[PDB]
């Protein structure tokens, strides 16, 4: 059975009678004339499996697949889509925590997306089994997938986002500097640290509380000795203008006197034979809520809402692959005193094969819908905020599936600090970004502490982490329990100042970053982007991975080595060196001239802290506060009246002055090559002209 | 690794004598290369090219030898030099390594950076055997898939090798 529907550049191909992990509405589902052949696809239904094939040319680029520890162009690899606790993951390890079954093909400069809506163990064999083919294997007898027409990569993502859901719009503080550890406690130490940080000049947006705050790792509880007075802690942080984000796992402790266990009864996951699925997690013996059910979600939202009512500002969802340790612990019990080394098979941490769920009233095997588990947990958690009437929503999740962007930020998990990790993190966050999940980041300074030798805790590397993530949407420092203290205030003055300046620079650019966040929530455009996103027609761009675009205007080439200078590859067009003002012609390689290699392409408008504005070339931009700004024909127009502190214009042609609303001439000062500054400090009714 | 050799009960017939594999093992590739060389003679093919992974004293009579499944990394540049020079000083002149490293991406300690790839091309500039080879799951290492900056560097290096080819071939003679 084969059916194809078309709707605004999106082809929905239905094979057999699919039972999707989640149902995505299809505006006007209309039959199509388009055949599988005209779509360049071949399909085969076998033993409870669907195989979809597409040809692969030598110059064809394949991107996407979300969180992958591989090069951005995915060719020559067989990828597995299965959420799993990757542990202390290294590069080229697969799979990881998140599964976005979407890949985009760019052939002859034209982009086309392929989204397979199955949360099962989908296999993407990209030119590995067959050098000239992309073979996708879905371990189900039926499946629904989508061919998303471009032609621009941005077009594909817009349509894909329209289909699976627009990213929610988080508050501006969610993009601020976050400090975290596993863990900070007791409660007085939390406040003491925040005070030292603030006293030394670090603007801390929020503090994350890891599992040590709970009582015996029981969800929704406060450790009786470390956190005696939680409301006192919350008021102390709030009066210091700092947000509180608490981690919340998915394991409900099998405890006779534990409220959530008793109230959740009836809504937990079961196994084939009918009993509850009892496993092992932080709390010890645990059961898990079956988030695929509506009543479980409503029950969970209630708990989240009640937890939020104390004044908790955000929820950090962890271990939601979902992960379980019963199988691993079982192996250790039996082969305990045996002088042998166990092979580290990460799949052993997934739910066992006999676990079942009830999706839309139907009973399904865990392996068929696994990857969507975190999606539904995030959904229920989001609902918790709605229940609390909390407009400022902040949810962080480790795992995910297509659509997770509707409800949460995603961080790259337990990374290991090392120089190589700088490059790895870039691939990870960009992989997520190009796959529909805009709000991402990594643990600044690396998560791993000191439990194995291959961990680099040097201070100059730490600084490079802060610098690397300068424009990442999620900016958080997190460390394992046995790791050295990585808070900037514990660094020697030399390094402390470097981190301080980097953080201050991030806040200076926050207005731009947040404006891009708005763009993301409205159009589904990613905030940080690999170079090929803006220049998909240039094959060279698919090999550049130590550089990334921040929106459409800013190119950042972070220094990811011990060197003081690096080589920077510039795409076609003119680029402005942010620090020394030099303008360079695109499609060339130049040497960096500052510790933070920043460039603005010709045709940029950048909002900065304190109402500052930078304009270079012609373009149109929408600030986060809804004010539209346009630069064209030496004229900067504003959709409405806004204040302007300092205006910086980069121009090859000289600027002698500017005219505000046709009636006020303001002197300009040339600060350096191609750079003109005007101290305006006043409300602009609607336009500024450059003379 | 020794588990991958022939088991101890294997025997061969060498000059009318039944011998244990462990006594003559290392010469196996020598005789295979010999038979292959004879294949070219049988075809009245004067331009002979035979590449072998293993060998024994005398293997130089019939084949080139490359250093096998190397792992791309900066340290490998030095290792390959020791390997090819070790062979060279031991009577096997026509040698080389896989430019860019054989290993693809089946383990973490593999460096597929582009500047390293260029250094491989540069390292082997005067090696007798100049070949780029990669495992199935490795990234595409052909110069044509490199950004212009690196593509040109490889291009110039290869052109330089061809410029010196007459000297290299004279040394081969």
Coordinates of C-alpha atoms in Angstrom, one line a residue, chain A residues 28 56 96 108 134 210 241 309 327 371 579 612 617:
Chain A
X28 CA -4.5 20.5 3.5
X56 CA 24.0 9.5 -4.1
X96 CA 24.2 9.5 21.1
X108 CA 23.7 21.0 -7.8
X134 CA 21.6 6.4 0.6
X210 CA 22.0 18.8 40.3
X241 CA 18.3 38.6 40.2
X309 CA 5.0 27.2 42.4
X327 CA 20.8 -4.5 33.0
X371 CA 13.2 8.0 20.7
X579 CA 38.3 44.3 15.8
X612 CA 24.0 50.3 20.4
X617 CA 25.8 47.3 3.9

